[PDB]
Each structure stands twice: as C-alpha cells, then as structure tokens.
Amino acid sequence: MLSPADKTNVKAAWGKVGAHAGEYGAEALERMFLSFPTTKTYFPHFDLSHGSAQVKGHGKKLADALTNAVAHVDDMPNALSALSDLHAHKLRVDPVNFKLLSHCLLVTLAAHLPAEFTPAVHASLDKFLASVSTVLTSKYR
Amino acid sequence: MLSPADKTNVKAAWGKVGAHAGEYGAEALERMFLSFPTTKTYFPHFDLSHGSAQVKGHGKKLADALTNAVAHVDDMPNALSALSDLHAHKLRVDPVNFKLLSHCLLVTLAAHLPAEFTPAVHASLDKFLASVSTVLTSKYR
Amino acid sequence: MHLTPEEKSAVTALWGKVNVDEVGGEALGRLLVVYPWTQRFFESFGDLSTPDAVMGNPKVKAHGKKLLGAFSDGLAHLDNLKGTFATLSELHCDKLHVDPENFRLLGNVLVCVLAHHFGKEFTPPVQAAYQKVVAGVANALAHKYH
Amino acid sequence: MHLTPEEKSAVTALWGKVNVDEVGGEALGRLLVVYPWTQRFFESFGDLSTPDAVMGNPKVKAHGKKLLGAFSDGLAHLDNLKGTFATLSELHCDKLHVDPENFRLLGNVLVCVLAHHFGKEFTPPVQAAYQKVVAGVANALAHKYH
Numbered sequence: 001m002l003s004p005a006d007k008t009n010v011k012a013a014w015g016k017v018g019a020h021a022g023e024y025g026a027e028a029l030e031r032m033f034l035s036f037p038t039t040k041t042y043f044p045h046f047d048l049s050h051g052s053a054q055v056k057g058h059g060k061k062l063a064d065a066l067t068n069a070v071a072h073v074d075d076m077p078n079a080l081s082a083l084s085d086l087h088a089h090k091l092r093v094d095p096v097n098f099k100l101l102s103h104c105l106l107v108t109l110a111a112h113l114p115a116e117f118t119p120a121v122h123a124s125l126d127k128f129l130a131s132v133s134t135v136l137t138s139k140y141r
Numbered sequence: 142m143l144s145p146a147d148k149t150n151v152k153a154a155w156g157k158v159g160a161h162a163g164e165y166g167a168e169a170l171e172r173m174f175l176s177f178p179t180t181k182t183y184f185p186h187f188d189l190s191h192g193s194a195q196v197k198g199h200g201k202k203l204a205d206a207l208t209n210a211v212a213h214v215d216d217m218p219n220a221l222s223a224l225s226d227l228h229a230h231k232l233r234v235d236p237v238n239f240k241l242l243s244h245c246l247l248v249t250l251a252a253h254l255p256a257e258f259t260p261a262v263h264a265s266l267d268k269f270l271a272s273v274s275t276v277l278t279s280k281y282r
Numbered sequence: 283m284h285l286t287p288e289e290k291s292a293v294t295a296l297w298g299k300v301n302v303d304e305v306g307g308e309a310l311g312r313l314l315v316v317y318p319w320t321q322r323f324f325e326s327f328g329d330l331s332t333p334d335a336v337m338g339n340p341k342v343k344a345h346g347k348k349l350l351g352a353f354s355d356g357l358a359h360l361d362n363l364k365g366t367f368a369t370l371s372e373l374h375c376d377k378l379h380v381d382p383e384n385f386r387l388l389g390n391v392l393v394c395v396l397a398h399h400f401g402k403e404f405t406p407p408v409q410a411a412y413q414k415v416v417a418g419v420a421n422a423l424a425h426k427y428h
Numbered sequence: 429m430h431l432t433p434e435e436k437s438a439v440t441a442l443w444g445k446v447n448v449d450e451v452g453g454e455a456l457g458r459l460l461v462v463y464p465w466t467q468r469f470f471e472s473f474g475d476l477s478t479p480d481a482v483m484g485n486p487k488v489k490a491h492g493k494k495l496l497g498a499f500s501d502g503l504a505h506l507d508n509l510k511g512t513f514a515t516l517s518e519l520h521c522d523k524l525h526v527d528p529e530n531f532r533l534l535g536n537v538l539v540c541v542l543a544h545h546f547g548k549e550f551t552p553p554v555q556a557a558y559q560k561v562v563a564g565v566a567n568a569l570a571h572k573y574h
C-alpha cells in the first residue's frame with residue numbers, strides 16, 4: 001500500500017520532526033482527549049490535565065514507536081510485533097480509536113510543519129498511520 | 142489473520158448455504174437498504190423495490206464473488222483482483238459501507254442457518270467478511 | 283427516540299417472545315467471543331479461554347441477564363431513551379470506563395442473536411426497526427460521556 | 429447545536445480570520461487528494477490525476493468557495509444547524525446522491541487545513557471546539573436522508 005513516493009514522503013516529514021517527536025506525541029494525545037472524550041476511558045489511571053508528565057511520558061513512547069515504524073517501514077509487522085501483542089491481548093483498545101489518534105497526529109504535524117505538510121505529504125502520512133494502525137490491531141482476533 | 146480453523150468454519154457454513162447463495166445475497170442487500178438508507182446513495186440507477194430483478198441480479202453476483210473468495214481463501218487478493226480494481230477505480234464506495242453490508246450478510250446467514258451459526262462460526266464469518274472487505278478496498282489509494 | 287407506530291409495534295411484538303435471561307446471556311457471550319477485546323472489563327469473571335467456556339460461564343450469563351433486563355425496560359420508554367438511561371450513562375463513563383463503541387458492538391450482536399433466534403420472522407423491516415432501537419440505546423448510553 | 433461559551437468564542441474568533449475562498453479551495457482539494465474515492469462526485473471537473481492538478485484546478489477552487497460559503501453561514505446559526513441545512517440536506521440526498529460519510533471526511537480535512545494555516549494558534553481546545561462544529565454540520569447535512 002505504501003508506494004515508494006509515500007515512503008519517501010514519510011521519511012522526509014518525520015525527519016523534519018526530529019527531536020520534537022516526543023513533544024508532538026504528547027500534543028497529539030492531548031488533542032485527542034479534548035476532541036474525542038471517549039478515548040479518555042482507556043486512561044482512568046492518568047492525570048490528563050494540560051502539562052501532565054504522565055501524558056508527556058506516554059507521548060514520548062508513542063513517538064518513539066512511530067520513529068521505529070518509520071525506520072522499518074518495509075518490515076513494520078516485525079518491528080511493532082510486541083506492541084501489537086500488547087494492544088491485542090492486554091490493553092485491548094477498540095480499533096475505532098486508532099483512527100482518532102491518527103487524525104490528531106495529522107493535525108499536530110500540520111500545526112508544526114507549515115512548509116512540509118503539502119497535499120501529497122498529507123496523503124502519504126494518512127496512509128502511513130492507517131498502515132501502523134492496521135499492524136497494531138492485526139492480532140486482535 | 143484468518144486462522145486455519147476460521148477457514149474450516151467458513152467453508153462449512155458456505156457449503157450449507159449452497160444453491161441459496163444468490164437468494165441470500167439479494168436478501169442481505171434488501172436488509173442493508175432498509176436498515177442503512179445511506180447505502181442507497183450508491184444505487185440511484187437501480188429499481189430497489191422488493192424482489193426487483195436488478196437487486197436479485199446483483200445478489201447473485203455478490204454471492205458468486207463470496208463463493209470465489211471462500212474457494213480461494215488462501216489467495217484472496219489474487220482471487221479478487223478484478224473486483225478490487227473495479228471498486229477502487231470505478232465504483233469508489235466509501236469503505237465504511239462494507240461494514241454495513243457485512244453486518245447484513247451475517248444477519249441473513251443467522252436467519253437461515255440455525256444449526257450452523259454457533260458463536261465460533263459467527264466469529265469466523267465476521268473475520269472472513271472483514272478480510273474480504275479489506276481486500277476489496279486495498280487499492281483505493 | 284423517534285419511530286413510527288408500525289416500527290414500534292414490530293419491536294414490541296417480537297420482544298414479547300424473547301427469553302430475556304437466555305438471550306442476554308447469549309448476546310453478551312457472543313460479544314466476548316466475536317470481539318474478544320471486549321473481555322477487558324471482565325477478567326474477574328474467571329475462565330474466558332474458549333468459546334464454550336465463555337458461553338457456559340455463569341458470571342457471563344448473570345451479567346448478560348442484568349444488562350438485557352435494563353435494555354428490556356428501555357423498550358417501554360422508546361420516547362425518552364436519553365432520560366431513561368442518563369444515570370447509567372454517567373455510571374459507565376465515570377466509574378466503569380466503558381468505551382461507548384462497545385454499546386454499538388453489543389447492539390449488532392444482539393440483532394444477530396435475534397435473527398438466529400427468530401429466523402424468517404426477523405424480516406428486513408423488523409430488522410430495520412431493531413437497528414434504529416439499538417443505535418438509539420447506544421446513543422443514549424453514550425450521551426453523558428465527558 | 430450546543431457549545432460552551434468558551435467553545436463558541438473560540439470558533440467565531442478564528443473564523444473571523446478565515447478567507448473562505450482560499451480555505452474552501454484547499455479543503456476540497458485535499459479531500460480529493462487524500463481520499464481519492466471522493467472524486468466520484470466531480471467527474472465533470474476535469475483533471476484530478478495528480479495533487480498539483482487537483483489543487484490548481486479552477487472548478488475545485490470554485491466549488492470549494494461555494495461549499496465553505498454555505499458552511500460559513502451555518503456558523504451564524506449554530507443553535508439550529510438542522511433547520512439551517514435542511515434544504516441542502518435534501519438536495520445532497522435526492523439529487524446529488526452523496527454518501528454522508530463524505531461530510532465527516534471533509535470535516536476532518538477542514539480541521540487539518542485550519543491547523544496548517546493557523547499553526548500554534550490552533551490549540552487543542554480550539555480544535556476540540558471545531559471538531560464539535562464539523563460533526564454537527566455533518567449530522568445536519570445527513571438529517572433529511574431517507
């Protein structure tokens with residue numbers, strides 16, 4: 001599904017994110033909690049207030065996983081295998097929520113990547129996140 | 142994603158369907174049009190009255206494709222290559238509608254397969270229909 | 283909820299033939315089998331290792347009877363689902379932490395169970411009426427999330 | 429449609445700075461690029477083969493401005509979106525045959541475009557207010573479907 005141009009686009013955009021990846025991961029989660037309050041049902045043990053270190057901490061792990069996914073775009077099932085297991089068998093997040101976080105990550109990148117977020121890059125990133133989401137829910141049943 | 146036992150369940154249940162597949166396909170469409178009226182936006186060129194030859198005709202083609210998928214369950218992407226092309230390039234049905242048709246085909250099967258529609262076979266059939274739907278939308282972008 | 287006189291009579295007539303305990307146990311069981319991530323709230327129920335274990339789990343049957351009983355009571359108030367389920371909505375959000383997507387999943391499994399149970403009597407128009415009702419109930423249970 | 433005073437003030441302030449012409453063109457074009465099956469309703473628009481073709485296409489720009497203009501006026505009637513869009517709803521159903529899922533997709537692309545255009549000023553709470561609005565407008569447009 002990811003064409004050579006999509007792959008190039010994602011590496012370029014994510015390259016631009018660079019050291020900010022963790023910051024942007026936290027912002028994406030916060031956007032998701034505010035915009036789509038039902039997703040908060042999965043984090044009852046967190047302080048979700050603005051600036052929460054728990055949210056910042058989780059945002060970094062999220063971003064790190066995405067970084068690993070980009071670096072292994074051609075072998076994503078293996079690189080995220082343990083994360084696929086974790087979501088399927090322990091966290092058990094309903095798959096509908098992955099589309100909500102993906103949208104919120106897109107909005108975050110848009111707000112921080114003025115030059116880089118072109119229509120072509122937008123489309124490639126959306127395809128990339130759907131692919132990641134698919135991998136993460138692949139073992140649910 | 143489809144385990145070997147899923148494949149066995151689907152083959153046994155579709156076997157039961159047998160020559161009724163066309164009838165059942167037409168009924169599942171009728172159920173969809175009635176339960177999910179937005180799906181009618183894709184058929185403004187059809188007579189959607191009950192028992193309509195166009196609906197019965199489309200039901201048979203629907204059933205034929207699923208029979209093909211069940212017969213080539215281990216090679217569905219290649220088996221449904223043409224149909225994947227046609228939905229991506231011409232019909233361009235929004236992916237959300239595939240879940241709605243899948244639900245109505247399950248209801249149709251349940252209503253006709255009392256003995257065979259056990260919890261395990263239900264689960265295998267739901268997985269199968271999602272797989273078929275994934276294949277049919279895999280070339281959309 | 284807004285249904286026509288025809289739709290409402292069709293719902294009520296079918297429901298009179300339903301064994302709420304049996305159907306509720308079946309619908310919850312199939313939910314946990316068909317969409318196993320929904321098992322996340324029920325670890326305290328014990329053995330959910332296989333379909334037969336789920337379907338024969340007495341705590342599954344007990345919970346299934348309890349939620350379908352509340353559903354059943356809902357059918358008597360089709361004109362005020364929102365108000366009827368307001369406090370249950372709060373409870374599922376604030377204390378139980380149940381993603382409302384689960385209510386939609388249960389709704390669709392319930393429709394399949396009714397079709398299995400009633401066969402040809404579960405006609406397309408009767409299905410259409412129940413589809414409105416289970417979407418109505420899921421919407422009302424989701425109404426107080428924040 | 430009901431918002432908090434904070435949500436409504438967030439929506440109207442940012443919207444005062446939006447050039448409906450420019451934004452409407454970008455939103456429709458990105459919809460056609462990112463979700464190319466939506467191109468099924470614009471066969472007569474000509475060249476949509478590449479992003480750059482889509483984005484420079486004058487009929488896309490023109491149609492963009494037209495629908496965001498109608499969107500814009502709806503922002504002046506947030507308390508009654510259903511009443512505001514009833515006529516356009518029937519049109520989209522009975523004459524245009526547009527699957528209402530398309531309204532939600534456009535909603536989300538529009539949010540991406542505002543974020544792209546306004547950068548850090550499009551804060552998480554402002555996004556949250558707009559998400560409510562685009563969902564309300566989408567539901568208003570789907571209301572007279574049958």
Ligand code: HEM
Binds near residue numbers: 042066
């Ligand atoms: C792009 C999709 C996603 C990625 C890359 C991702 C990745 C991760 C990672 C890296 C962890 C931490 C694992 C560890 O602690 O070692 C995690 C945990 C978690 N994820 Fe996911 N996630 C995704 C989507 C979601 C969604 C959509 C939700 C819920 C709305 C979610 C809910 C959770 C929860 C509840 C935790 C545990 C937090 C804690 O208590 O530490 N995830 N995820």
Ligand code: HEM
Binds near residue numbers: 203206234
């Ligand atoms: C399990 C999913 C599906 C399968 C197996 C399937 C298969 C088919 C087949 C076999 C054809 C005819 C191909 C030909 O003869 O050229 C067809 C046509 C069509 N399909 Fe799909 N379909 C599926 C889902 C859907 C959905 C969800 C919709 C719409 C809600 C849809 C809309 C259409 C339309 C509009 C046509 C053309 C009918 C005509 O004018 O003859 N399909 N489909």
Ligand code: HEM
Binds near residue numbers: 350378388419
């Ligand atoms: C139409 C469907 C539903 C209705 C009407 C319903 C109703 C109820 C009722 C009556 C209670 C008891 C509240 C009390 O003790 O005051 C309850 C508890 C609960 N429900 Fe829901 N429910 C529904 C759907 C669901 C679904 C699909 C899930 C999750 C998969 C769920 C999970 C729970 C949990 C975890 C409890 C608490 C169990 C306990 O403490 O024993 N509910 N529900």
Ligand code: HEM
Binds near residue numbers: 499
């Ligand atoms: C915020 C959502 C939307 C609003 C307010 C809106 C509004 C409008 C309006 C006012 C017109 C012009 C009618 C006329 O001048 O006679 C129109 C027509 C149309 N709209 Fe919508 N629209 C929306 C979303 C969409 C979307 C997402 C699609 C499909 C992807 C769509 C497809 C069309 C089509 C096909 C036409 C007719 C174009 C032509 O005349 O060639 N609309 N829309």
